[PDB]
Amino acid sequence: KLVADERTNSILISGDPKVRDRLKRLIRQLDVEMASKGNNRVVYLK
């Protein structure tokens, strides 16, 4: 199974060294860019 901390922002795991192989895989899988959501913009009226 699964844990983490947002003091650290760190995945913790509970289970296999197969869960350690595949979930170091998923440690890595969703680490990447945040893709600059630009959720908000400020448009300068012409």
């Binding site: 945040m34 959501k37 630009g38 959720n39 908000n40 400020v42 300068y44």
Partner: protein, 50 residues
């Protein structure tokens, strides 16, 4: 929160530009020109109200 933060920061950085400024010079030109001629001759005889 850290995203909301990074977001507010990107909003404040784009609203926080210097403001240009206008020198509004109005130019009111009131130019008035008047010309009157009164000419008129009045006869009168008050001995006999005429």
């Amino acid at each position: 929160p850290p995203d909301i933060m990074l977001a507010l920061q990107e909003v404040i950085t784009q609203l926080d530009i210097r403001r240009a400024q206008v020198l509004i010079e109005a130019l009111i030109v009131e130019m008035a020109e008047g010309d009157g001629v009164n000419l008129g001759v009045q006869w009168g005889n008050l001995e006999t109200g005429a």
